[PDB]
Structure formats: C-alpha cells, structure tokens
Amino acid sequence: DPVYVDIDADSAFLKALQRAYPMFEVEPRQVTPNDAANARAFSHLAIKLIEQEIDPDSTILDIGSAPARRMMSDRKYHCVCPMRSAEDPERLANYARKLASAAGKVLDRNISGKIGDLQAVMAVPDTETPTFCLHTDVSCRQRADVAIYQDVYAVHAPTSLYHQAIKGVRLAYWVGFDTTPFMYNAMAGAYPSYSTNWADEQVLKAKNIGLCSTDLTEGRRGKLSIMRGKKLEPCDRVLFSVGSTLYPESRKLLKSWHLPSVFHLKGKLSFTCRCDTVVSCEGYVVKRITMSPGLYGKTTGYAVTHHADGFLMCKTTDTVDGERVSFSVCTYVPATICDQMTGILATEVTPEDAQKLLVGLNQRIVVNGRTQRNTNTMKNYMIPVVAQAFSKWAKECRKDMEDEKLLGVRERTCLWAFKKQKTHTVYKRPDTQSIQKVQAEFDSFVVPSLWSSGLSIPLRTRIKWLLSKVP
Amino acid sequence: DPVYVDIDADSAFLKALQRAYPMFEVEPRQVTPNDAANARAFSHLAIKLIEQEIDPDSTILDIGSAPARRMMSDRKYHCVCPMRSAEDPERLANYARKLASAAGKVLDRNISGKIGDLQAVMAVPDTETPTFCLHTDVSCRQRADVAIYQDVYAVHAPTSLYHQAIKGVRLAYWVGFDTTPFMYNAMAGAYPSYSTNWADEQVLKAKNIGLCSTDLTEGRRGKLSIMRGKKLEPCDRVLFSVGSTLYPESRKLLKSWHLPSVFHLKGKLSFTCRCDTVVSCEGYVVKRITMSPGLYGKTTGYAVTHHADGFLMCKTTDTVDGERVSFSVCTYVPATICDQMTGILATEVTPEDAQKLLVGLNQRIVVNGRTQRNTNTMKNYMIPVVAQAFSKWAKECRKDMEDEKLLGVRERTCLWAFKKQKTHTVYKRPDTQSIQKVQAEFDSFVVPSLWSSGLSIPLRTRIKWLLSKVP
Amino acid sequence: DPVYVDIDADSAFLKALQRAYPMFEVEPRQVTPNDAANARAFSHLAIKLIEQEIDPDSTILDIGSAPARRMMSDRKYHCVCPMRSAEDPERLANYARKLASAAGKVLDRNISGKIGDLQAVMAVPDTETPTFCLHTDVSCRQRADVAIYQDVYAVHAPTSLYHQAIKGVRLAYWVGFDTTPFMYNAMAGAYPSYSTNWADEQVLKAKNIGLCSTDLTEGRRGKLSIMRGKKLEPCDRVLFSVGSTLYPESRKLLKSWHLPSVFHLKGKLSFTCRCDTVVSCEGYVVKRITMSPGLYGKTTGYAVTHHADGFLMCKTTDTVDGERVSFSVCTYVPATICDQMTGILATEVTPEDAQKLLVGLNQRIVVNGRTQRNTNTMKNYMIPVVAQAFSKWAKECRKDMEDEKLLGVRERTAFKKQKTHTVYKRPDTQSIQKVQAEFDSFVVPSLWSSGLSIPLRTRIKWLLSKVP
Amino acid sequence: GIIETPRGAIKVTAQPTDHVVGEYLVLSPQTVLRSQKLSLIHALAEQVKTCTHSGRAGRYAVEAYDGRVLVPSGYAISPEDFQSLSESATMVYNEREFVNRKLHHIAMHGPALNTDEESYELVRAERTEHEYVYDVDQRRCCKKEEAAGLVLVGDLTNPPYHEFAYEGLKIRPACPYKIAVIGVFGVPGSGKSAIIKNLVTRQDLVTSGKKENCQEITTDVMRQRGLEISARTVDSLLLNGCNRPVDVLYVDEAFACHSGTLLALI
Ligand SMILES: Nc1nc2c(ncn2[C@@H]2O[C@H](COP(=O)(O)OP(=O)(O)OP(=O)(O)O)[C@@H](O)[C@H]2O)c(=O)[nH]1
Ligand SMILES: Nc1nc2c(ncn2[C@@H]2O[C@H](COP(=O)(O)OP(=O)(O)OP(=O)(O)O)[C@@H](O)[C@H]2O)c(=O)[nH]1
Ligand SMILES: Nc1nc2c(ncn2[C@@H]2O[C@H](COP(=O)(O)OP(=O)(O)OP(=O)(O)O)[C@@H](O)[C@H]2O)c(=O)[nH]1
Ligand SMILES: Nc1ncnc2c1ncn2[C@@H]1O[C@H](COP(=O)(O)OP(=O)(O)OP(=O)(O)O)[C@@H](O)[C@H]1O
Ligand SMILES: Nc1ncnc2c1ncn2[C@@H]1O[C@H](COP(=O)(O)OP(=O)(O)OP(=O)(O)O)[C@@H](O)[C@H]1O
Ligand SMILES: Nc1ncnc2c1ncn2[C@@H]1O[C@H](COP(=O)(O)OP(=O)(O)OP(=O)(O)O)[C@@H](O)[C@H]1O
Ligand SMILES: [Zn+2]
Ligand SMILES: [Zn+2]
Ligand SMILES: [Zn+2]
C-alpha cells in the first residue's frame, strides 16, 4: 500500500506532495540522479489516483502513449500510437524487446495476447486490434467509454473531444502544466518548483532571463538592418525546457485547453460538457471532463482559476542582442513569503531595500550536532526580478489614495475624453480568483483527410526478427 | 453519535463548528483535498440536525435536489427535479448507476421500490410517484407535510411557499448564505471563512478586489467614446465563486428570501406564517418557516439581523479598465480583532499606522491577564481595505463632538432646506442589530403557466440500459 | 435538588445568577445555541421560586400564557388563551400534538382530563372549563385565588387588577423588564447583560446606536421640506429587540406598571393594595401585589427604586438620515467599574483620556491570574457613550464649588436656570418619582367576539381523533 | 498498584502488568515520591532523580535518559529488608544503560580526539571475530544477528559484563532466609581463614572473596590437610544457577559486598 517515489530523502518537495495526496502514504526511494525527478513523481501519483476511481472491467483509450508503461497494469488499455515523432522508433523497439523477455515468466498478465496483437498489426498496417493500432485520434474506430490524456499539447481540444464523444465516451482526464500564464499574453516565465523555463522565439538572445545566451562585445554607435521592426509583440512559437530536454510548442493549441465551465458541442449530434479541477500543486493540474448526449442549460463563457500561491507579472528592461528593450515576465511565489511581506508594502520602498529583506527572510543556517547546512525556501535567481515587482506595486496603490473620485459618477469633461492610467505590475494574492472571457459555442469540426501508413520496411523487419523465439 | 467531517485535523475552523453545534461531537478525517471543504461541512451537519428535529413517518419534499444524496436514509423523501441545468444529466446517470450497484446488498432501505419507481417514470413522463417526479415546484401534485430548500436561489419565495401551503404543508426549512449584504446595495464583497468571492458584472476588470483580472498598459491620453456614461450603479447581474466553481445569480431573486418576522399570504385561501433563525456561523444561516391557515394579528414589515461579528462597508477607489472610479465593498471581521481595536480609535489615526497595528495584532492577543496566539486570524489579502475603513470612521466621530447642537430642535432654512453631512463608512459592532423595511402583504399569485417535458430519446435509452443490469 | 439552566459552562452570568437565587444551586448544561439564553434562564428560576412559596391547594390563573409548558406541573392552572396574535395558532397546535403523543404513558398528571376538556371547548367555543378558556382577562368568569403575569405589556394594570379582585383574588405576581428608563423619558437605551436594544421610530435611521441602519450614497446640499418640524419629542410607538426577535410596544401601557407603594381602587367595591419588589438582577424585577377589601390608611403617591449598580443617562449628538440632531440615551454600568473611577473624576478630564482608562480597567486588569474581571466586564460597544458622560459630569461638578451662595436665601434678579447634560446614579442610591395613587375609572371594554376559524377547529379535532 | 502492610511488615503484590524483571517491580521515581505508603525509601527516589530528561536537539544533541526504581514483590518481609533489597536491584538496572548510551553516543557523533575512545572502532558487520559485539540499530549487546549499518567494537565490548547481569535479576530471590548469621571480626587471616582452612566441613564450598581468595583456600586445604574442597567464586555463584544446597556455609570477606546481595545469595 505504500507508494514509492524517486525523490531524495531530505528534499523539501516531499511535504508538498503529501498534502496534495492525503489518501496515500509516500516513502522516498532514489535509484537514479535524474535532473527532472520532481516532474515525474507527480505524474506517477496522478495515474494511481485515477485508476482508484475508475470502474473495473471497462476498456480505456490512451491517446499518444508509450505502450511500455501500461504493460504490468491489470486494466484494459487500447494504445493509439502514430509514428509522427522523432523518438517513436525507440519506444516501439523497447516495447517489443521487453515483451519478448517477459514471455514465460509472468503467469497472468495477458502477455500471450499482446505478442499475438503486435504480430497481427505488423502484417497488415490498416488492421484494428484491441490493444494496438497505428491510427490517429480522429482515425481510430474502436469504441470505449474512458479516455486519458497525459502531457499532450499537440491537439485541438474541442475537435478531439467531439470525435471521442461520437464513439460513446462519457469521461476524460488531462494531466499537464497550467495554462493561466499564457492567457495573460506573457513573453517569458518559469516554474521554479520543477526546474522548468520557457521563453519566446524573439528573446532567445537576452542576458538576464532563465533561458538565454549571449556573448561579449565592445559596443558600436552604428549598425544598419533591412528590418525596420519598431514593434515587439509575442509570436506563435514558444520553446519549453524541462530539466535538460527541449520541447517546441505553439500558443494556439496551448490556449485551446483553457476550457470554460460549461460549453456545448453542436453538429450532427449534440452534447453538453463540463470541466472541473481536482488536483493542483504549484503548477500541475488535473482536469476531469464529463460528456452527456443532448442539449441542456445555458452558457456564460467564463473561466475561473483559484490561486493558492502568489502570482506575479511585471515589466523588465533587458538588452537583446545589444539593444535595450522591455517585455513582461511572470512567475510564482510561495505563500509564506507573501504573508510576511504585508507590513512593509504599506509605505514606499526602493528596490534595494526589498531585495535585502527578501534575502534575510529566505536563508537560514541549520546545525545538526556538528554538521552545518544552508536552507532556502525559493530559488535565489528569481529574487532580483521579484523585488522590482513589489516596489512598483507599492507605488501604484498610494497614488490611488490622494486622487479620490466622487461616488457614482465618471469624470469626463476641456474635451469629452477620459485619461487612461499606466499599469506595470499585476499581483494576485493567495486565496484570490481570476476570471477570463473565452468561447463556449463550437459549431464546425469538419476536418477530412486521408490516412497514410506511417511505417518503414527496415523497421518492420527489425521488429519481426526481434519477435522471433520459441517462447 | 460521533459525526465525521472532511476537514484537516489541524484547521482552526473546527472550533467554530463545535460552538455552532453543541449537541453533537464532531471529529475530523480527511480523504479529499477539496478547495471548498469548509462549505460542505456546514451543509452536512445542517441536514443531520433537521432530520433529528422532525418526527419520523412524515413525508418530505425536496425542491431541486440530487436523489443520490438521499439514497441511504430512513425518512420518506419525494425528489422533485426538473431538467434545467447542465449538471442534471450527470446527476441522473449517477443515481441510476449507484442504484443498480446495490440491488442485493442492502435490505433495510426500500431499494426495490426506488428501482420500480424509476422505470415507471421512464415509460411516460407525466406520472406522479411517491419517490420520483419530473415537475417543477408549482406543478407537482404530491401532498406532504415538510418541505426542504437546500442552496436554492432560483425561485420566488412568496410564490413558491404559497403553492406548497395549499397542499397541506406546515413546516419548511432553508439553508444558504446570508442576504444582509444585498440590502445595503454593495458593489462587491467576500466571505473570508469559506473562500467565497462575489462581484458585479460591470467591475469584472478591476485590479485590487477578490474577483478581477486586468493587463498591463502604458497609458493613452484621451480615448474615443461612442456612448456616454456618467452613471455607475449596481445592476441585476451578480457572479459567485465558491472556491473554484462559478455561479451566476440575480439580485431580485436573492433579496426575496430576506423575509420579515410576520407576513400574510392572501389569495383564494389565506394563511398566517412566521420566520425565525436558529443557526448562524460567519455567513451561513438556517431559517425556519411555519404556516397556519387563517388571518391573525397585525403586521409591521420589519426585518432584524443580529451581528455576532463585525460587519464593515466602506468606499474605495480603484482602476477599472484603465479608468479611475469609486464604489463600495463589504466584508466580515472577527470579534476578537474588533474588541482589541477599541483603544486607539478614540483619536485620529493614519491608514499606514492602522495597517501596522493590525499586522501585529494578528499574531498576539491578551486574555484574562495572560498572553497567547490569536488562533482566529484573518486573511491577509483584505487587511489594506479594512485599515482604511477604520481611519475614516475615527475622523467622522470627531466632527460630531465639535458641532454640539441644542436638544429638541432641528435646524431648517415656503421651502426649508437642510444640509446633509458626509458619511463614507458603515460599521456594525458585535452585539448590534440592524432593522430594515420590507414588504409584508402579498396577494398577486396568479401564474397560469403550462408544463412541458424536458427529456430526450438518447438520455432515456441510456437510463433503461443502465437499469437493465439485474445483477 | 439542583436546577439545570441552558447556558454555557464558562459564562460570566453564572455568578450573578447564583447570587440572586441563594436558596437553590445552579448547574449549567447547554443543548441549544440560542441567542437569548440569559433571558430564559431568569424566567425559569423565577417560576420555581413562586411555585414553592404558594399553597399547593389553591387555583392559579394565567393571563396570555402558553399551555404547552404547563403540562408537566403538579399544580392547578386555568389558562386564558385568546386569539389576538400570529403566534397563538402555532402554540395551540403544539399543545394538541403533545397531549396526544403523551397519552397513556404518563398517567399521573391528569392527561385524560385535559384531553377531554379541550375537546369540549372545541365543540362549543363559549363554555368556561376548569382547565381551558377562550375569553380575555376581563370576560373570563372563573374564580380562583392566585393570578400570575409573565412578560405581559399589553394590558392596563389598574383596570386588569380590579377585575381580578372582584372574583376573589388576593395575590398576584409580575415578571418583566425594569420600567425605570421610561419614567425619565429617554429616546433610546440598552440592556447589555441580556443583549436587548430598544429605540423609537423617529431615530431608526441613526448611525451610532444599538438598533439602527443607515445608507452610504450621499454628500449633497439642500433638502426641501414642506413641514417645519423643529421638534424632537418621544412618541407612543417603541420597538424592542431581544436577541433576533422584534416586539412593538407602547409607552403609555409600559408606564402603567410602575405602581406606587400604596394605592386605592374605588368603584362598586373598594380595595387597598400594596406593591413590593422581591428579586432584581440587572434589568428583570419580580413584583408581588396583595389585595384586601375595604379602605384603610392614606396614600402619598410616590415610587422608589433602589440601584445596586450604576444607572446613567446622558445627551449625545448623531446624524439621522444625514441631518445632525441631539437626543438622550441611557444604559447600565457595573458597580466595580464605578468604584474604581472615584479618584480620577476629582478633576476635569478629556473625553479621549477617559476612554483609554476605561479600556484598561475593563480588559487589561490582573491580580493573580485567578479571578480578575473575567477580561470582559462591560461590553465594548457602549464605552464611547460612557466616557462622554463622565467627562461632562466632572466638569459640571467643579462649577458648583465656584458659585458658593448663602444659607437659607435665594437670589432673584427672576432667576436663572443652569444647564444639565448628565444624570448619574451611583450604587446604593435611590430615586423617587411622583405617580397616581387613586383610581376610580370603571370602564367597560366589553365587546366579546370569538376568534376561532373553521379550518383551525378541524385541524385541532383531527389531531385528537387518534388516541395514540 | 496497591501496597498492603500486614501488621507492620510490608509486602508488595505484583498485579500491574507493566515491565517487570524476574519478581521485581519497575516504576517511575516520581510515582514513589507521591505516595505516603512508600515513605521508607524516599531517599533513594531523590538520588535516582536528577537523572531524567527528554533529550535535546541542535548543537548540543543528546538522547533521553530514563531511570527506574526496583522493588521486591510477592513476599511478606520485614520493612528493614525492603530498603536494602530495593537498592541492590535498582543500582544494577541503572548501570546497564549508562554504558549503553556511551557506546551509542560515540556511534552517531565523533569520538573525542584527546581521550581513550579511539579504542572503539567501527567494524564491518561480516568480519566479527568478536564473540559478543555491540550493535547500533537496536542499541543492545548481541552475538550474531546481522547488525545492519556498521558495527562498533571496543574494550568493554569484548566481555559484556554489564549485559551479563541484566538476566541475573530473573532468578534473584526475594524472601530472606532465616539462619543464625554469625561472624568473625578483626583483621582477617588469623583464625577465620583457618576456620575454612584447617577445620572446614565436607559439604562446604569455597566461593567467597575474589577469584584469588577462592583458589588459595582450595590450595591451602589440599596441601596442608586435604578434604578435596573445590572452588567457585562469588560472581559465578551469584550469576550462574545454583546446585545441591551447602550443608554449612563459610563465606569470608562478604562485608565488602552489599548486604542486599548477600540476602539473596543465602
Ligand atoms: N512541454 C512538454 N512537456 C513534456 C512532454 N512530454 C513530457 N513532458 C514532461 O517532461 C517531463 C520528463 O519527461 P520524461 O518523463 O523523462 O519522458 P519519458 O516518457 O520518460 O521519455 P522521453 O521523452 O524520451 O524522455 C515529464 O514529466 C513531462 O511532464 C511534451 O510533449 N511537452
Ligand atoms: N451561489 C450558489 N452556491 C451553491 C449552489 N449549489 C451549491 N452551492 C454551494 O457551493 C458548494 C459547492 O458544492 P460541491 O462541493 O461542488 O458539492 P455538490 O454541490 O454536491 O456538487 P456540484 O454540483 O459540483 O456543486 C456547496 O457546498 C454549496 O454550499 C448554487 O446553486 N448557487
Ligand atoms: N418586550 C417583550 N418581550 C417578550 C415578550 N414575550 C416574551 N418576551 C421576552 O423574550 C425573551 C426570549 O424568549 P423568546 O425568544 O421570545 O421565546 P419564548 O419566550 O420561550 O417563547 P415564544 O414566545 O413562543 O417565542 C423572553 O425571555 C421574554 O422575556 C413580549 O411580548 N414583549
Ligand atoms: N493527432 C495525434 N493523435 C494522436 N497522437 C498524436 C497526434 N499527434 C502526435 N501524436 C503523438 O504525441 C506525441 C507528440 O508528437 P509531436 O508531433 O508533437 O512531436 P514534436 O515534434 O516533438 O512536438 P512536441 O514537442 O510539441 O510534442 C507523439 O508521440 C505522437 O505519436
Ligand atoms: N422552478 C424550479 N423548481 C424546482 N427546481 C428548479 C426550478 N428552477 C430550477 N430548478 C433547479 O435548480 C437547479 C440549478 O439551478 P438552475 O436551474 O437555475 O441552473 P443555473 O442556470 O446554473 O443557475 P444557478 O446558478 O442559479 O444554479 C436545477 O437542478 C433545477 O432543477
Ligand atoms: N386583554 C388580554 N387578555 C389576555 N391576554 C391577552 C390580552 N391581550 C393580549 N393578550 C395576549 O398577549 C399576547 C401578546 O399579543 P398582543 O395582543 O400583545 O399582540 P402582539 O403585537 O403580537 O404582541 P406585543 O404587542 O406585546 O408586542 C397574546 O398572546 C395575547 O393573546
Ligand atoms: Zn485503434
Ligand atoms: Zn412530484
Ligand atoms: Zn377563563
């Protein structure tokens, strides 16, 4: 019954894991020094929680999953495995090798069925098999009732969900990052608890952000370019870096998963949908979607996010390829730090004073008999940018206290125009909600195409030879 | 006898629950990290108290309830549930699936009767049965004795009660939020103890309230205006956020449940009825209404609310979509903080000075000549607004002492004009009552409204298939 | 023989309650989080004291009572229950349900007789029965020995007592609030020990009193008015608030119960009566009245009240609907607080200085960590009013010593009247007032009409149709 | 539990099911002080006190040290014998963990450099030429049970003499024996040695004194007269089980030993 995770025994992330999963008990057991250990521990516990609340003897659709992970599970899985990625061949070869080595040593795991399923598919690519297929989400023609997504950011959420509901699916799950920073139209950000940094294509040559690179120079007073520019706005291309692995993503598909509370799917058949958040821990969320046939209720087109920790978004100045520009950066702040800062933001503080006080509140020296250790609450490299945000916030709130307006009227006079004030910092305190306007009515989903066999003969021969032995 | 609640064992809300329910023994056990755990514990205990108070073998009506919650009970329930919300199809499917999963495991309850009841209704939708029906509150034709409203905000209180009374109902109950803030015509507010925030639709783009969202701007001097404003008053649309779930509401239907002490319902038949409050805990109240035929006594049309905690309403200046405006907000303050705050409020105190003392007073208090922690702390994100409100109140109380006037006279300046002094805050101290004027005579109840079904073929087929599982 | 009260086990009201009833022993036991627990504990103990004192062989009359709470009693009660309020139908239905439910189990308290008697009244709603009645206190024609009033403020007192006397009643009791604040003609007041606040209709839109409600949208100049009032004087209508319940009252009927020590009743027959106070505790009093035929002695027409704690009345300035006015308020002060401020009040003190001293004396006092002042002796929402009164009282006392005058003479220029803004009655002090002591008005408010409806009769009879 | 005093004499019943060794009751020092019935041994309760704390963490980290008081139970004895019997049993119980903590303290922290603690080293759990060796996981003395981690050795680790006395309390008698206890006074080695040397009986065993004293009499009787008297020692006689009762007992130099130990020995 104990659940074992690959976390160091002295890590401070263990306490956060326990409060997020109070129905389990977690014991650390480290076997490898992976650079993204925290990002994998959460995913492991999420799968265990889902399987505990799913009715048994029911088939499950797993979209875009490596089949080597669902081998020892006692449930029924149908893996959809297209071959449009650069690391698919390794996963397929590893799955075949592990399957062959497991034959004859495991009593009841349906190993023989899996072996027969793989051989049948390799003979005819277009065949359909209960445990394996090479179609896409909109091409698979196998009926089920539960669908599971895991770290998928390459599909359109309304279009993909509609095709699943046609086959008769009434439940779905999603595991991944938090979409809220991308709804604010930010340029760069970071998730410090999981050692993840993301940035835009146009700021990859910055100097003082999480993910950048530059070089030394002397500085010249003249240089000409054919691009006038004069406009720095976010684009559709975004780079992700989790640990030491790179992932290219797109903004349009990321924002499509910020579903509203209630929405309708209208087409040949009609459905009514909902969306809830069950687990949230410092950036990772788990979502549950229910689908029913018919058309009921009314829609409002609003999305609500609940903040347990502080959320910051400020404006910074940096040099990109030698030129000084300005953009926006977002991050997360622990709740304990935010509560202890309430006293000093009642006055005006310079950035230097804020930085010094934050350092004192963060670092402590701990002695255990004769050993000495230094302990930190949050990562140190984000302190300078955070200190700037508090200084600006404390100044904007004061100005509202002298220019007091009348109650119930709008000031609009020499000309009938109203002045718009400047804003440089958005700060969301703990126990505060944010609301956004999105779309709730979806009509067109027609995306016809032709299916092409994504496989090669050299790969087919290698798999067949590997799956050739008397057991 | 012990009652279990899904609350953390180290929370500070357990003390408040014990004080509100001295006839029970509550102890905590946690199985889910829900974001609205405090709002469900109160509802669970309220139902237990109501069931104990009333005698057995009495028929009870539920107005818009989930039948799955009353499956395991001894009392005779009659569930009235139309199909008017997006959650209705999900609730019905859950009820059918759970009912068929315990056909031969529970013998004490009337499981067989419920299953047969569901099937009979599914045949034709116009059947009245002792357990299930698909009508509204003014279309059901089942005679009972007790009616229960649990978290119902979408009905008119006088009209709904009259239709229940003519069928022979003597007692009723209501469980929900306090409606006092909405009689003061506030623009936004919060319930800190239950992580609930509400705001008007016109101010959803604010910056420093519990429910808002804005972006960064540089400032545009002068803007185009096709239409003219100059008016900023609350409208009928209000949005609620209980932890992480969104609920739209209406002001007129919200204010209809703030009934006076005595009122008459005179139509074809006449009744005389009262209203009392039995349980109140930091925002949640339980109301009891008893009807009786005939006309007796005289009415006065006054409503009284008793404050066990401080209630505040101040006027603040904020920036909505880049423009400076002013509006009013309201909140609750713990009693302990208010009592310790009396000493310095006899002089003039700046908002900065008040903020510093509130932060310090949030960690230590003095009781019975000794010292301890507060243990009844208040949320930090609302301290800035509270501190400003106290300063205005102190200033206003010092101008009345310097303007002493003669007893028995009222200065007037044929017209007679008298000046009105300025008031910017309203503060209701603990152990103080509020009295207001409402309506106490209702006669117009004529609503000749027809009825129509709301089911569909695809949903009916699914329910029949689920109930077809005899084992 | 212990008595159980429905209050908290750590409430400070236990010490006051035990001291007022030294012939019992009080034990706490809480089963309901009621908002008026203090007000119900006193009434429960008051009835117990009265019951044991009287002869258990006499007949007792109840005026406007609820028969439900008189079921489990070994005495004889004649309940007078008219139908003139919205609460009576609920009480009558509850009485019928309890009688049928407890039939055949407790066969000791004469349950069968009560059940049969109730049915007889339902058939003919004009008969007089030993247990139940449907007339008023004037129209009832039952003879007894003792009459009991409990929280009755809607009956003229000299008239009601005379009608009881001619039927052979020699003793009476009354339990209710103190009527002293209404003799000083105040505008608003409070009873902080019982969470009770009252006010007049003309000041219901105040800002800094215990029972008011104001608005926020304002700030303008000029409000045209047709009538030129210029007058603020108390009117008949007065509203009460006990916990979270509202009660309308009238000043004239409230002042009629402030009876003098000796008074005469004249008419067809003559009687002499006396009034005495037995129990007093921070606002509730218990009065005993005796009647005797004939005329004896002479009257003086004076009423005397004894103060065990401080009684205060001052003048305050507030804004009603936006307009600044002035009126008077009153409250009660604990005796310990009054004693400890004797030395401070020797000179002139600023109101803000007095407020700080009061806060320290109230919630910041310690002696050994055992008793102290329970860290809350006086409720914190009445301190600003009290601090203002002491400051004005001290200032006015100093002016008296600076205007020393001769003995036995008065000066006329034709005399000047000074200004008074505070009346302060210290503990161990008595107040005297002049009232009427001779009554001879034999009014006959005799317009009898039943108030029972056909649907209500059917429901009551149906509840008693089944014997279980 | 309850303590009965039948007509002056004091006897204790062992009805509590708490930690008991042999026929001796174990109870906290604070319990003894708060009882007027046990006022005869209140002096020992004060002495065993000042040695009860609940550990400490930080720069100066220690472990909880708990002491207990041992009293005989089940037998009706004189009140005077109750005092001496408690002292002997209690002292042994407090002695055993005093050494145990010292070895455990060295393991977790660093041994002192300018001391003698370098005689204690950390040794692999496999190479265990030490017949008895002290372990850290269970903080006892054990022969071979695969002590995980890294095992400690030392000087007193070789013979665990402190551990050889904990089990002795299991067979420790409680009822004193009634017999004419006579004694010879004066500087020894004049006639009292000769009583057990030249005119000792057949069934007597020379177990008294130090191991050298036990053997000298055996060599003295055999060389001078004979009579084949064997030789055991006090430590072995007290720890190991006894045999056929001695006819007449001629213990010498027993006044060095504690009186309570002699009472159980007889
Ligand atoms: N932005 C983004 N993050 C991903 C994606 N896939 C996985 N991750 C995250 O990267 C973290 C570490 O990746 P791994 O668990 O090592 O991936 P794997 O399944 O073991 O196999 P590899 O991708 O070859 O390393 C995971 O926990 C995911 O949260 C993706 O496609 N896009
Ligand atoms: N303003 C408002 N509050 C509600 C309503 N319904 C429930 N609530 C409250 O919000 C809380 C949320 O309830 P949940 O924890 O989601 O449990 P549930 O009501 O059984 O299931 P849901 O349908 O998801 O709400 C409830 O405890 C109620 O106190 C509503 O219709 N309007
Ligand atoms: N001013 C005034 N006070 C009353 C009246 N009736 C009762 N009270 C007081 O209200 C206090 C609180 O009692 P309630 O909350 O009314 O409940 P109850 O007296 O037990 O029974 P009900 O009259 O049915 O409410 C009582 O102690 C009375 O002293 C009245 O008619 N006028
Ligand atoms: N339309 C789809 N339906 C089902 N699975 C898909 C689909 N598209 C991709 N996948 C699978 O999900 C994973 C993502 O494939 P993708 O083409 O996005 O690789 P990529 O070039 O590295 O881009 P990214 O880093 O955003 O994932 C692949 O393993 C793929 O098999
Ligand atoms: N007139 C009615 N009588 C009985 N039940 C009703 C009535 N109107 C609505 N309900 C029930 O209220 C429940 C939820 O409220 P509603 O139908 O208004 O959904 P909504 O659009 O989300 O609005 P709200 O936020 O107030 O709940 C539904 O289950 C519905 O059955
Ligand atoms: N003349 C009377 N004789 C006996 N009982 C009476 C008489 N008048 C009123 N009562 C009873 O006193 C109780 C108080 O009802 P009341 O007539 O005073 O009207 P109310 O407005 O409901 O109460 P109140 O005016 O005291 O606030 C009722 O139960 C009523 O039956
Ligand atoms: Zn497939
Ligand atoms: Zn129905
Ligand atoms: Zn009568």
Residue numbers in the entry:
A (entry chain D), B (entry chain E): 2 to 414, 419 to 476
C (entry chain F): 2 to 414, 422 to 476
D (entry chain Y): 1 to 266
From the article:
Chikungunya virus (CHIKV, genus Alphavirus, family Togaviridae) is a mosquito-borne pathogen that has spread globally and caused a substantial health burden of acute febrile illness progressing to debilitating, often chronic polyarthritis in millions of people. While nsP1 + 2 + 4 forms the core RNA replicase (referred as RC core hereafter) to catalyze the essential chemical reactions during RNA polymerization, nsP3 is likely to play additional but essential roles in viral spherule formation and RNA replication inside virus-infected cells.
Using a tandem purification strategy, we successfully reconstituted two complexes: the full-length proteins of nsP1 and nsP4 (nsP1 + 4) and the full-length proteins of nsP1, nsP2, and nsP4 but not nsP3MZ (nsP1 + 2 + 4). In addition, nsP2 is close to the tips of the hooking loops of nsP1 (chains C and D), forming a three-way interaction network between nsP1, nsP2, and nsP4. The nsP2h-bound RNA may represent the product RNA being exported from the viral spherule before being transported either to the ribosome for translation or to the capsid proteins for virion assembly.
